[PDB]
Amino acid sequence: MLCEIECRALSTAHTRLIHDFEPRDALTYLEGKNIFTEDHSELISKMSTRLERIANFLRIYRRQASELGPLIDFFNYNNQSHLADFLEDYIDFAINEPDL
Amino acid sequence: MLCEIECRALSTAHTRLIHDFEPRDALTYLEGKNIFTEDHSELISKMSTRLERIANFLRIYRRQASELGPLIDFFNYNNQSHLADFLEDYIDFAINEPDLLRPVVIAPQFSRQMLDRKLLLGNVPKQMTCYIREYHVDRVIKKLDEMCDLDSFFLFLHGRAGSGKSVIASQALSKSDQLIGINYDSIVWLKDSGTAPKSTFDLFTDILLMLKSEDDLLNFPSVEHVTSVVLKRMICNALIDRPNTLFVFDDVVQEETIRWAQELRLRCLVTTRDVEISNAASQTCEFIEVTSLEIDECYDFLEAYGMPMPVGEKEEDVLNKTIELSSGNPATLMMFFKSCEPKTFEKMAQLNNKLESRGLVGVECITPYSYKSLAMALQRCVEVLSDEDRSALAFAVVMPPGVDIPVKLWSCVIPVEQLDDEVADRLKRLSKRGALLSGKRMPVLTFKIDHIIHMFLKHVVDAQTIANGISILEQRLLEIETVIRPEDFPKFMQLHQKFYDSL
Amino acid sequence: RQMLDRKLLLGNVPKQMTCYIREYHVDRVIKKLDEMCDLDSFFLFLHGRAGSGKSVIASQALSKSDQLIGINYDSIVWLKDSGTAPKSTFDLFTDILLMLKSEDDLLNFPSVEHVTSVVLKRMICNALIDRPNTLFVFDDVVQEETIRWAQELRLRCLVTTRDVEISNAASQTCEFIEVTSLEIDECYDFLEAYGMPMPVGEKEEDVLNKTIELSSGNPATLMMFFKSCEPKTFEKMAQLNNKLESRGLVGVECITPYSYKSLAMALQRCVEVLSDEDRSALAFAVVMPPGVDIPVKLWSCVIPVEQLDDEVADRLKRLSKRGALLSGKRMPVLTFKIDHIIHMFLKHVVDAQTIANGISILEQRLLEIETVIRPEDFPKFMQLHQKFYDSL
Ligand SMILES: Nc1ncnc2c1ncn2[C@@H]1O[C@H](COP(=O)(O)OP(=O)(O)OP(=O)(O)O)[C@@H](O)[C@H]1O
Ligand SMILES: Nc1ncnc2c1ncn2[C@@H]1O[C@H](COP(=O)(O)OP(=O)(O)OP(=O)(O)O)[C@@H](O)[C@H]1O
Ligand SMILES: [Mg+2]
Ligand SMILES: [Mg+2]
């Protein structure tokens, strides 16, 4: 599981993950880095609208990964680096400082 | 407290919160996250049945929390995550992606049986399964769908008396599965018919009780004695647990109800005869008029109720006589059928006579109408009339029904310088208020009185005042088809000698 | 923006009107309320003529910004007064206490109907303890005692009223905002807002300057006007402009969001309340030409009562202070003025005799021995207004 910091990030950067993103794009990269299951990708891969595939990707994801690595290491490769940069910036303004 | 969205969710996801859940499980988690008290948990914790602990948890909760957060967390931790997931899905299809809530998270929730349950409890009557006025029931439902978004609004289903308005609301809330469940959560249908000044308060006494839980109808107090400011405050309070609740106000006569409906920020369907009650509301008022049944619709309506359709030419005419007399009126048409037992074209024509020599009383019968005959209804429409307007109407008997006729030709019989537009002003109020007359702007300002609206006055005004108005006309006679009567030829109302000699 | 509506509804605040929102006023109301959320108790007087629109503005001033409710004040209590009886000032505060009462224990509501004033007052605040920053709109005060109670109860009050002097009851500082007659430009805006056709020709605008002159910027009667123009054509708009001269306000009386069929039903009261002697002064003003700035002495002629008639002026001030029936002006010279809405009513209401008697009573003193006021060399002839005098 993640936590409040790592899940607060997927939520804060949500206005953005709706305008440009797609869970189908990440399913192959995650069935791979060992964070999904062939029913998981089925469940998120057959969804009529994208806000469905997105809400299931963000629900399913928060349970499966030991951390928020294999999703920064993806928006990079997917030409959606303006995303993986925002999230890595957010994880840093908490990892390198003890005050909020 | 929450709001209509957050409370509509606790209500939509209610079929579920009953099958698996328990308020005892959440009390500890909520005394904690700072929402309830040690009496709160006492009140919900000692309850014999769970539907009690549930209805108190959902009542008490909607008041206490600044938002719908902690509940999701609770459902998640409690291994009831199939719940906190449904509610978080619902809260998301509102803020970010609008519209999608009804097609996706609301439509599957539709349930006709629930509609019954919901219809019955909202005191909605049965609809006319036999004949359905296509056009109207449809357009009603449409304009209601357009507004479930709106926070408060008036829909005026206004028409003649017995013109069939109330039946259409029965059908418009009974056809689709959308209006109840999808667009609005609950229904409250209350018949007004208030004339006294205490009536507009008494109405809203029975709304509050239409709202109040099955529990505490026992505790119902002598609310009979308590100010208007309090019944009003008392309602809009018990109205928090009424998300997306619709209000049918079958038969409003007093514009004071409309004023209360707008102080109470209600969502209202309104059947009425007098349309001007809407001037009471400074607001989104939208209107649908129940017209006289078109000539083709009359046929459909007859066939639908086993009525024999014409063949010979003076048989379609026997039936055009009924349609002309009834002038496309649902209620008196129905009284006709119940009273044409023989069904013969013959006994159908017998009645066509009885109607000319006995007015509506010739066909008065036991009918689904609260009224033996349309005259019992119209009685009221006429009492309410401005004292001066009561006069104007009363003299309209002289005019031949079903004829488009000039304002000046009317200025002759109607009571009151040189410009008689005042006649027109009365005649407008007259069509606006029970749709007794009929306004028609060009080619030239002319009105017209139909037959049902006539044989009402025929057997109702002073037998003298008929003959006095006729003479008062023949005096102005001299003075100085698809074609309206010209000003070169008013001197002779004699065209209608036929329809005048029968006095 | 969904919490407000909860708070507005429960504080019995009416619905919000948006079709026409008097910018200036709703703004200035909100402002002067923001300045005071700090204060412990205070009176805000939104005074104006009958149907001048005061009550509507309080509906809007508490409905536009969400600061007033939540940020500046925690809750709202909006109660309509309209009290005339001596039991009314107590009955008001009875409901006030009831309003304080929560939903719980509205069941237990006692026969509080019978209990002293000292106790409803002590009891009210007992409940008030659970109320922080609770504004109290008192829509339509016509009794000073209500204010007196408001100040014994150390309340925070918005107040709509017609008679401004009720504020002399409060020793505490009371700020004021006057709802004036709708300016000529605002009238246009108001008309357009409600589908009313704007002139394309001089005659057209003059037809419309006739309505604005008759209505004299009175929203309530203006509204009654609109509701009564089905054709709406500049033509039927001018038809009515006539009906107004030959039938007074009763020519356009209609079903309106106003509790009143016509402005005459309202003003009725404003006139009953009047000092018995002042009721007299007002009653004779009908003879005077409306929308004309005219000297005190020229008034001393029709008004009842040594050699200094300032007493006339004293009555005429009370007269503008108390329903804003008259107009006040200090220099160039002390002159008052009666508008048309305030006039047509009198024209079609006051004893048909007393009109003609005042006209003659003026002629007796008439002989005596434009952007210009009438000079003392030329009072002998009120004949300038023969036009607006022959129509009697
Ligand atoms: N669609 C319909 N099918 C069958 N009967 C109808 C229909 N519409 C109207 N009627 C007749 O009218 C009677 C009830 O009329 P309805 O209540 O619909 O009119 P209404 O406009 O409500 O009159 P009111 O305003 O007086 O209530 C029924 O008993 C029936 O006789
Ligand atoms: N901003 C506005 N928009 C639309 N109508 C208005 C407005 N202001 C006033 N009115 C008209 O006046 C009526 C109510 O007037 P309002 O209650 O605002 O005046 P008022 O000063 O409260 O009079 P009173 O002191 O007698 O209560 C409304 O029905 C409407 O016809
Ligand atoms: Mg009915
Ligand atoms: Mg008011």
Numbering used by the authors:
A (entry chain H): 1 to 100
B (entry chain A): 1 to 416, 424 to 487, 521 to 543
C (entry chain D): 112 to 416, 424 to 487, 521 to 543
Study authors write:
In Caenorhabditis elegans (C. elegans), onset of programmed cell death is marked with the activation of CED-3, a process that requires assembly of the CED-4 apoptosome. CED-3 is synthesized as an inactive zymogen; its activation requires association with the CED-4 apoptosome. Activated CED-3 forms a holoenzyme with the CED-4 apoptosome to cleave a wide range of substrates, leading to irreversible cell death. Here, we report cryo-EM structures of the CED-4 apoptosome and three distinct CED-4/CED-3 complexes that mimic different activation stages for CED-3.
Multiple oligomeric states of the CED-4 apoptosome were observed after global 3D classification. Hexamers, heptamers, and octamers account for 80.5%, 10.3%, and 9.2%, respectively, of total particles. For the hexamer, the top ring-like density was of ∼ 5.9 Å resolution, and the “broken” funnel was determined to 4.2 Å. The gap of the funnel is not sufficient to accommodate a fourth dimer. Most of the CED-4 apoptosome molecules are pre-mature hexamers, which may represent a potential regulatory step.
